[PDB]
Amino acid sequence: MKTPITEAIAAADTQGRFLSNTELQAVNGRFERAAASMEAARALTNNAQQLIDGAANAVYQKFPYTTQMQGANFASDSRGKSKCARDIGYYLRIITYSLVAGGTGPLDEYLIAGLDEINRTFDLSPSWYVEALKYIKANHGLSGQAANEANTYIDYAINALS
Amino acid sequence: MKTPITEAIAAADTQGRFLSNTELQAVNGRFERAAASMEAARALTNNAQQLIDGAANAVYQKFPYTTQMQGANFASDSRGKSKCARDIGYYLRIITYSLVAGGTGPLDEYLIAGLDEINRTFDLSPSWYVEALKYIKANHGLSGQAANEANTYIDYAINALS
Ligand SMILES: *[C@H](C)[C@H]1/C(=C/c2[nH]c(/C=C3N=C(/C=C4\NC(=O)C(CC)=C4C)C(C)=C\3CCC(=O)O)c(CCC(=O)O)c2C)NC(=O)[C@@H]1C
Ligand SMILES: *[C@H](C)[C@H]1/C(=C/c2[nH]c(/C=C3N=C(/C=C4\NC(=O)C(CC)=C4C)C(C)=C\3CCC(=O)O)c(CCC(=O)O)c2C)NC(=O)[C@@H]1C
Numbered sequence A, B: 001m002k003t004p005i006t007e008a009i010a011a012a013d014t015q016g017r018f019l020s021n022t023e024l025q026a027v028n029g030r031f032e033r034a035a036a037s038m039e040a041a042r043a044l045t046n047n048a049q050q051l052i053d054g055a056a057n058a059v060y061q062k063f064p065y066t067t068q069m070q071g072a073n074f075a076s077d078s079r080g081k082s083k084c085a086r087d088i089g090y091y092l093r094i095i096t097y098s099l100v101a102g103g104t105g106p107l108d109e110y111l112i113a114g115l116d117e118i119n120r121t122f123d124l125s126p127s128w129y130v131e132a133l134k135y136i137k138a139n140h141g142l143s144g145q146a147a148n149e150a151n152t153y154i155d156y157a158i159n160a161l162s
């Protein structure tokens, strides 16, 4: 919901002022990293299923009980594994949203808001998703500024879980 | 607020999907003009007072009665001239907003919505502001796409007054 440009423009219109030079430089900085953020979003989108399966398997190997113990919260049956892949897809989709927007707005609204309440209500462990995000970070195949932006948002999500 | 970025993000989030390649291309089309848009907005912001004064003067020369009439409607005293400069400042400010946002969103939300109502209630002639915008378009001193951006938001405002 929140992007840098929109917040700046709304505040300026409330005050009835032109945008300050600091605001202009912030928006210019967002635009200067926009091509790398676009490359990062394209990489994450085109390799989404491979990254999701790798991350889910990494969780399964770091937390083996999740594949052995019966119960709704775990991934013993195919339903639980599908739910796990779906959760990781949630994270990756909102990460691409934040990359496209060039800010933490999408992650703050669609994911982080109440995240701990969600994980505790359905007995989900945050370390699972931390490890899945570590896997996605270490396997996105990005280089340069695109890797920097992708890592920025992945680390943001990780910190939200931490 | 509605920009070409938030549009694609909302259209992708409501369906629980990633951004389509068409949406990616629209976002990249905004990005490939962001540089010229920022150049135009910076130029118009830095030379705002001179442009406002020149546009007000051009309005006074094209419509001389506006400087010779009594009544709150017109600008014979200093109060009316100050109000006219303030109106032109509104126009230029919202135009810079639309430049920074890369779309007609800010112009639609802050200016055009109710503009006919404003100009009719207080008996302000839209041709005045049309001539002021013509002066701005002829005297912004921009080149290349930076002009093409500025012009495309001037004419828009002009089209909203016709
Ligand atoms: C995979 C890493 C591990 C795992 C996954 C799992 N989840 C459920 C249920 C849910 N997961 C969520 C998460 C979200 N929904 C959102 O909108 C957002 C923000 C974008 C998040 C983070 C939710 C809400 C649920 C409950 C609702 C639902 O099931 O759709 C299950 C099944 C639990 C159950 O009680 O049925 C599983 C298995 N569990 C593991 O063991 C994997 C390692
Ligand atoms: C100057 C080009 C000509 C002109 C100016 C003039 N304006 C007023 C007062 C008003 N101008 C507006 C326009 C807007 N207010 C907004 O918020 C927006 C959108 C951002 C716009 C476009 C309005 C609403 C008013 C009335 C409110 C106010 O007075 O502050 C006057 C005085 C009119 C009166 O009766 O008080 C004048 C003179 N008139 C000319 O002759 C100039 C050529």
Ligand SMILES: [Mg+2]
Pocket: A116, A117
């Ligand atoms: Mg809490």
Ligand SMILES: [Mg+2]
Pocket: B116, B160, B161, B162
């Ligand atoms: Mg009309």
